[PDB]
Amino acid sequence: VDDVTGEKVREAFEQFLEDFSVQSTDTGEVEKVYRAQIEFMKIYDLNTIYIDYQHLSMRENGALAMAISEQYYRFLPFLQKGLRRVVRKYAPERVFQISFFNLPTVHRIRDIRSEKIGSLLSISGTVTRTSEVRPELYKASFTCDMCRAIVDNVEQSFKYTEPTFCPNPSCENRAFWTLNVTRSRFLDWQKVRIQENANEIPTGSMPRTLDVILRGDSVERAKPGDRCKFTGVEIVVPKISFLACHVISIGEINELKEMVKDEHIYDKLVRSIAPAVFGHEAVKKGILLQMLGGVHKSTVEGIKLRGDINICVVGDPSTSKSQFLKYVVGFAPRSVYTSGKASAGLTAAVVRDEEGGDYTIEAGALMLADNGICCIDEFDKMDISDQVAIHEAMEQQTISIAKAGIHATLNARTSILAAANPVGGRYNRKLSLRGNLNMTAPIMSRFDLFFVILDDCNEKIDTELASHIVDLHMKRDEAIEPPFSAEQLRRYIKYARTFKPILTKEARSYLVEKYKELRKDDRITVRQLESMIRLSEAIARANCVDEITPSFIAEAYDLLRQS
Amino acid sequence: VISIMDQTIKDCMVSLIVDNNLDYDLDEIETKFYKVRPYNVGSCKGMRELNPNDIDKLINLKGLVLRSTPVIPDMKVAFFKCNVCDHTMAVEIDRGVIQEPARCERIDCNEPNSMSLIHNRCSFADKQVIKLQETPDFVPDGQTPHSISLCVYDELVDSCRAGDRIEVTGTFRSKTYVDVVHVKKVSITDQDLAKIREVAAREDLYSLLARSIAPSIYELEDVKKGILLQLFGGTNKTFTKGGRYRGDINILLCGDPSTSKSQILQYVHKITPRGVYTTAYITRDVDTKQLVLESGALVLSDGGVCCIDEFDKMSDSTRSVLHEVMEQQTISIAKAGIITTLNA
Q1: From CA B101, how far away is CA A164, in angstroms rounded?
Q2: Nearest CB to B323: which of A117, A208, A378?
Q3: Same domain, yes or no, for A256 and A245?
Q4: GO molecular function: any one (chain A)?
């Protein structure tokens, strides 16, 4: 019933591609950019086009998009034949790849049913493992047993096929034709592993993973251990796999412009980054400034520097310092939490694949997050191997894996949130931080800020804390409630993240005196100076001011003096 | 009876349609199918009471699931195309066989030639085998916990996964398995309720229970009162999206030896329906390529109590998992193949 519907949908798709030219001068009326896109790729001949689904959803009141959207695998050669006919008529070794992107709905891996078999789908998640690219047979040149005649056979992406009848009536046999590789176009075929994101896992469930196939020039773009979003077709494999065609490295203005014009935003921000915790404004300040970094870019030579903020919390037992740990992971999308004591895995472990007996690098705790916060609870009960792997991952913003003869290093950006405890639990003011923390100097270094919490019997704030604890124990109390929700705070974090501010001369002249004042207390070296420099642009982004004044760096100087 | 109930429910529904004035609702219910999920049946003793006279009967299992295989597509229907003339034929299943037609039959392609099976255009029933750790209300002496391989089908896939206390019911088949008709992810007489209300109005009930919990031992008012209200539990309240709190107390006993300590440690194992006398661990199962969980101890008792003796002689490496379950009730594994925090 689709044999006469395929030519009509081919005519509709080529009418959509033929009736839309470019009239985009002076930001006037809109019309699609496809003919100039074909005219641009005429020189390079890659034929790996990108067609927006939002731009295709306006024709036939969306009904053309809804009919293509369910019968995509049954309409795909008609669409590529219509694309071939329009490039054969508008332009004079021929492979084609049509990619669809920007779907209005983002589907998870747990909502995949069998009602969407063959339809298009948007799958978001994180890549766990990757497979080295291999040639895809696609179409082969079979030769006959007696005719010696060439036949161009088209595979169906299932398994090694074979024709049935010879086209030339010189023979009618069904014996074994022989394969030929000259006249058989080959496309790189990669198989990667996608898995469920850490913020959308059900309670007690397992993060179920799946294998997704990818062809064309969409390969060698997906970086391992990065949140990715694919758009493709659900194809069954003799298992329900996936075929992707589009790759992207993923991971209101009336409210944002209203929130950047006032003057008391930062004071509600330090008490709204953790509304369940009573007290501890310094820890909330470091947690709020530890979500967004800055000035890492490129050194005047050619090496990247550590532009991130490392935050470590210490103190006595039974405090609310783990509550922040439970908040970050419940609010930040780029946040991976580990227990620490029960943990190579931290620094991205190595696992083998039997095809070539080849290694792949699993991110684990260390490389799972991108421009985010990796939070490690119980940092002092870990071993020596994972802590020197953390130190090897921290001196240079990269991680190295040396296994089976191959050495591979990669750029992983993370902000360590380390929760530690003393050797005896109770924090004594008798000695230094080094003998009480019980860890070596190097792993103690490259940490921008330390938060020490000590408790005692001070009734005036203690009765308020106990009343807040017993008032919290009810069905959704308003006591916890912040001055504004997280709804505008997420887009504010993203808007401050894409800002990129810079320092001045007065700030540098006050910074040299501040480094002398910090070194007069004396360990303190260049790393703490780099930590307060990185916290300066983070507080500049949080207060949304471009050129920084030294008065906002004075609060960071007071924060360093408070620690 | 399920096959004839599907016809009778459609017949009584169209009898309800014809009794009242309505719009065009008969255009979709004439071809729609409706089923029945019976679950209110009595308990059984797991797989141990499942004798061979109970094959193809309804059965119910209460326990926890440990491993969920990825849904596998089964082909309810299938497409066939004559590669030389392109006429399509849809075939359906019948007791597990798919007749493959040999030659074309249309009038445009009358010639005898070989068809081809296409699947990327055929609907598939989803099938999935799920590992289940069973635990009945009563267990015989010498019995070990069992791992039953149950199998779910369409419209029920990805609804049951590892980590929950699940009541399940279906048809026991035969290697043996259970074909699930229903899952239950959520969970006395009047004279007994009147006796409960009459015994709850007395003043000495607060000590009466502490005396009736163990009459073979001594007083132990604070200890017996604590284990009484420990098994009473408390109040477990949560938020809508990001908060949870459970009424719970973790108790420790220390002091002079040779008294009723082990007695209690056994008595409570004889009271709760879930508990081990001692954590679990995630595993990337390679056969199904999936993150299954495989356990006992505390993991099994994600409900009830869990008894540990000789706390001082226990190692320091395994104290870090109980450091999280003290007030956080969570498992955070960060190892090779798995970085997962879960309920415990």
Answers
A1: 16
A2: A378
A3: no
A4: ATP hydrolysis activity
